[PDB]
Design a protein around this ligand. Structure first.
Ligand SMILES: C[C@@]1(O)OC[C@H](O)C1(O)O
Length: 314
């Protein structure tokens, strides 16, 4: 009877497939029919069309990873006015446009990981670094990058951010851009790619142009990144239990459907996971707080290498 919609940025990417599977698995254990559906490409119109669709069908809850902070707001607010529980995972909208943000960590946390991974691989205070992710308008990544760039200028002033280009979650376009940066910048020391499509594309671009001495860190799935790690192209990268993330999003949504207290400070017990807690929106850097509105932070983030890459199954 209760239907929950789980919308990714796009389909075909291993990151969203894992999260969607963990969501449907969670819904099945709760007796909830979770419908996993997303556009073939990350666009505003793509998700809005779907959001409006699940609303008209009368879905009870919709969990969405936004491709734009304010792009989905008119459709999300329409849903809540009809009683549709709106939650966000991975990528957030505006805090007033949703209810809960199932976040994998604060921008300071994930922004620290990107810099720490880079500093450990470059091992010199004077170098040239380049950023390379999906889109300049996406929410989650731009929040990380801004905190990352701020952290770099404070902790590594000798580092020169020479460029910042995009791939738009396209495996083809990401490869072209990655090669272009590598060609145009022969003095490049490191590439920071906080994107599941950008990170393996950068590693591939390094191997295609046979460029060594190049630190390549970022955020992607161990499934895709595995060949590049074994060959030594990527010594270190990071992510999180995305399967668990999709699992939490459903459980939290279920707590809203069953009228449980989920204000800032309250907790919730999840089987096989433990204790999650509603953190304030200030953790993301937001100036917005409300009753029944907060951020659920993931318990643990993971650093991947050649030692523990076969440990996680998504
Ligand atoms: C994990 C991730 O960085 O890869 C795809 C998205 O950009 C993402 O979810 O933020």
């Amino acid at each position: 009877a209760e239907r929950i919609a789980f919308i990714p940025k796009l389909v075909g990417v291993g990151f969203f497939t894992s999260g969607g599977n963990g969501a449907q698995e969670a819904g099945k254990a709760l007796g909830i029919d979770v419908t996993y559906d997303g556009p073939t490409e990350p666009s505003v119109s793509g998700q809005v069309q779907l959001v409006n669709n699940f609303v008209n069908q009368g879905y009870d809850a919709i969990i969405v990873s936004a491709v734009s902070p304010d792009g989905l707001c008119p459709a999300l607010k329409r849903a809540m006015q009809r009683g549709v529980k709106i939650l966000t995972w991975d990528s957030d909208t505006k805090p007033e446009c949703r209810s809960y943000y199932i976040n994998q960590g604060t921008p300071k946390q994930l922004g620290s990981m990107l810099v720490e991974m880079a500093a450990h691989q470059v091992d010199k205070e004077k170098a040239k670094v380049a950023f390379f992710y999906s889109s300049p308008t996406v929410t989650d990544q731009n929040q990380w990058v801004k905190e990352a760039k701020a952290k770099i200028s404070q902790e590594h002033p000798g580092w020169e951010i020479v460029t910042t280009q995009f791939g738009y979650n396209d495996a083809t376009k990401s490869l072209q851009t990655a090669e272009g940066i590598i060609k145009a910048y022969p003095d490049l020391d490191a590439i920071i790619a906080p994107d599941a499509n950008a990170l393996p594309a950068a590693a591939q671009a390094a191997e295609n142009l046979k460029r060594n001495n190049l630190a390549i860190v970022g955020f992607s799935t161990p499934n895709v990144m595995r060949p590049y790690v074994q060959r030594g192209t990527v010594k270190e990268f990071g992510l999180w239990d995305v399967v668990q993330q999709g699992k939490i999003s459903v459980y939290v949504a279920n707590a809203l459907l069953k009228n449980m207290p989920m204000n800032v400070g309250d907790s919730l017990d999840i089987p096989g996971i433990g204790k999650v807690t509603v953190s304030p929106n200030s953790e993301q850097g937001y100036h917005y707080e409300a009753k029944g509105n907060g951020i659920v932070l993931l318990p643990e983030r993971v650093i991947f290498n050649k030692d523990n890459i076969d440990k996680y199954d998504f």
